[PDB]
């Protein structure tokens, strides 16, 4: 687990053979990480859109460990001010908001 | 309630005597709402910062009802692509992330 929100909900993830930190972000549809090298096929995706779009590489069905939960989901790889775990992967780990 | 994350976590809020919709956004530090007229004193606050800053009006100790829970917290009023309930109010309602 239960994560309270007095601080930013930053968690450790394992991806592409590296340990990274990322923000659990219920306001984000998608997961965006920078400075990871993922194997295999990808397609460009345009994201953002305010002021222009940002082009990223979309990798599908990526194995990722988020806080000890091994799951599978789409990871967008591209520059981002903070690594972000979006709703796409929060559903995979069974993460809910509760009050 | 328990809110799953397959869709965007949009909830009804009551503020400044109006019903509004807003996104429960764990990636946001602050709460930003547009098109609301709040009484009393405020101070400008600079937010954002990438590409420039956006100036908003910061109102403190605002009574707000979020999804049934009557709480008090800072509300920033200004243009926002979508109304956002940030961590500052999620702590007030006792909202946690759980998996």
């Amino acid at each position: 687990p239960q994560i309270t929100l007095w601080q930013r909900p930053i968690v450790t993830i394992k991806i592409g053979g590296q340990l990274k930190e990322a923000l659990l972000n219920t306001g984000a549809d998608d997961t965006t990480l920078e400075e990871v090298n993922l194997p295999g096929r990808w397609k460009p995706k345009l994201i953002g859109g305010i002021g222009g779009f940002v082009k990223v590489r979309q990798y599908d069905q990526v194995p990722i460990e988020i806080c000890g939960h091994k799951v599978i989901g789409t990871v967008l790889v591209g520059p981002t001010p903070t690594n972000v775990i979006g709703r796409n992967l929060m559903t995979q780990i069974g993460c809910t908001l509760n009050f | 309630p328990q809110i799953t994350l397959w869709q965007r976590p949009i909830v009804t809020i009551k503020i400044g005597g109006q019903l509004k919709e807003a996104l429960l956004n764990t990636g946001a530090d602050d709460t930003v709402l547009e098109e609301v007229n709040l009484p009393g004193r405020w101070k400008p606050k600079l937010i954002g910062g990438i590409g420039g800053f956006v100036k908003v009006r910061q109102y403190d100790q605002v009574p707000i009802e979020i999804c049934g829970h009557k709480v008090i917290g800072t509300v920033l009023v200004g243009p926002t692509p979508t109304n956002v309930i940030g961590r500052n109010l999620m702590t007030q309602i006792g909202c946690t992330l759980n998996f």
């Binding site: 306001g27 345009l46 903070t82 | -």
Partner: peptide, 7 residues
């Protein structure tokens, strides 16, 4: 901070 989304 404050982060949302959009393709």
């Amino acid at each position: 901070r404050v982060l949302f989304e959009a393709m």
